[PDB]
Design a protein around this nucleic acid. Structure first.
Ligand SMILES: [K+]
Ligand SMILES: [Mg+2]
Ligand SMILES: [Mg+2]
Ligand SMILES: [Mg+2]
Ligand SMILES: [Mg+2]
Ligand SMILES: [Mg+2]
Ligand SMILES: [Mg+2]
Ligand SMILES: [Mg+2]
Ligand SMILES: [Mg+2]
Length: 92
RNA sequence: GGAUGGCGAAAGCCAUUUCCGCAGGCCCCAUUGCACUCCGGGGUAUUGGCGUUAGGUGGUGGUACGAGGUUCGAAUCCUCGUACCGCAGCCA
């Protein structure tokens, strides 16, 4: 557990189309602090996972302790910090 | 794409097709995966469109050619249109 600007989320319902997932994720997470970006992919290795990048590490960390396990589409979210800064954060 | 026919030396472009295929509907298998350019696979439906970067309307930049205007005349500047290309969305 090494605090990062980006929370990593897996165990997401894989049926949900992309656009919808982002929309829903943004509604739930944008209320923990300002969000800079949400990355969703439905590649063989990326599906079921989502990368939410807050603007301040204090937000990401708060979202984590709070949304951990939260129902989402009949599936508990499993959240963690992202093993590595996100492209936009690092350049900055 | 294959085949067949048309102009061609090919490139290509056109056409046809109860050959194969693509996006869109609907099901099924597989994946618990730490990424930032994308990207598993299969069955069935399969009109129309397209042809592996594989559908469409209208829209924004571009490339191409055309028209009107600019001008003495323009290959310049201006706008309009069309074909295509990367693009966002929406629809299939
Ligand atoms: K045919
Ligand atoms: Mg052929
Ligand atoms: Mg021929
Ligand atoms: Mg001939
Ligand atoms: Mg041909
Ligand atoms: Mg299909
Ligand atoms: Mg298929
Ligand atoms: Mg002229
Ligand atoms: Mg004149």
């Amino acid at each position: 557990t090494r605090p990062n600007h980006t929370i990593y989320i897996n165990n997401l319902n894989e049926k949900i189309k992309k656009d919808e997932l982002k929309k829903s994720l943004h509604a739930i997470f944008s209320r923990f602090g300002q969000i800079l970006d949400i990355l969703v992919s439905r590649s063989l290795k990326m599906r079921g996972q989502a990368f939410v990048i807050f603007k301040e590490v204090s937000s990401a960390t708060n979202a984590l302790r709070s949304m951990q396990g939260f129902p989402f589409y009949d599936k508990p979210m499993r959240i963690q910090y992202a093993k590595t800064d996100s492209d936009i954060i690092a350049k900055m």
